[PDB]
Amino acid sequence: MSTLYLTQPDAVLSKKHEAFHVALKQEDGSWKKQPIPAQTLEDIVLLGYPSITGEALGYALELGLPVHYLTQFGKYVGSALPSESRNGQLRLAQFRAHEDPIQRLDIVKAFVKGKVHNQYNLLYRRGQVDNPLKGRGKLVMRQQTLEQVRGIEGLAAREYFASWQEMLGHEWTFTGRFRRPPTDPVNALLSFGYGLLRTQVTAAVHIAGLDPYIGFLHETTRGQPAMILDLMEEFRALVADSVVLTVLKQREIQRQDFTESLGAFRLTDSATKTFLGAFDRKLSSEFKHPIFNYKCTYRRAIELQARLLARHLQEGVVYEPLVIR
């Protein structure tokens, strides 16, 4: 629904009585203060830390326009979210069922039961003969402790990442994924994708009133949110992952990268503006919703899963996550 993106790190977003005015030119004229409609937006994403007005944040939040903050590369740094919800009873459930392990299990065993099948039902489409995650899926439910499941999610992540070189091609090398900064060239791009997936997932939690910091998979003992990731996890294979090989196949094969100050293979300006296009294109894909015939864009799918989990925490709904073959 008409998301906004800014990438010139010298601009200004001023306000005119109902709307925004962006300014770029930077003294080759009169700054080229071009108009922009604000009441039709749903979100704002910033990459270069552009100077925004102070009087405009308030208006963006009087409407429901969350502000985000990323870096040139695309790494996540923070966000300014709007008025929060009121169903604190929900959040109390989010927790009341967070410290009873016998429930936290039955929930994460769905989060992953709908995360490995979502990987295999992407590979089989890509053309992987076996790449056997179908087994890990069946071996989830057997498990009966969270420490017996986090290991499986990591193992499956590595089984899903070790099956990359044969999928990508001979051009780029993806031997493994590193926790340290983007040493691997292809891995500098998922931090973009997996970075600006939180842009659309750190607000769907704020729409259902879910407390971001209390989750079911990630131990909330490091200042890291738990719902923002735990929930962002299912959608790391299908909205922030299929984007990558969708664009790394038709587009940006190479010649649009750089390297400096650590090696640190980076991306390039004038290629981002194509990446973000790919992202808004993937978000606005319809996909017909394999539960009923919803036929809803992913952009909603997230905002839905949030409320479905909330109702699960209030109305005892069944948590049927997403899977597409």
Partner: protein, 92 residues
């Protein structure tokens, strides 16, 4: 998809109404012709905008119409020197 026009006199107490109506519609839609805006949007946006538009006019001195054009009717707006309507998200 909605479409808006206005016709307002040149009174210093009426010119303000124009220069505020543009500064309003800018936030609510696009721009094609001088006295005209084309605003593709939802309904509650209307209950927030209409309730602002009824809220700044005297009828004895101004003129405005509101044309509603949903997808099938928008498709054919044959023109010669302008791009036709649409409304995406924007990258800068």
């Amino acid at each position: 998809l909605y479409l808006i026009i206005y016709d307002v006199p040149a009174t210093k107490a009426g010119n303000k109404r124009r220069t505020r109506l543009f500064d309003l519609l800018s936030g609510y839609g696009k721009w094609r012709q001088f006295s005209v805006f084309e605003c593709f949007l939802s309904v509650k946006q209307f209950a927030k905008l209409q309730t602002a538009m009824e809220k700044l006019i005297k009828l004895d001195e101004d003129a405005v119409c509101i044309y509603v054009l949903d997808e099938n009717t928008v498709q054919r707006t044959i023109t010669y020197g302008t791009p036709q309507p649409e409304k995406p998200g924007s990258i800068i």
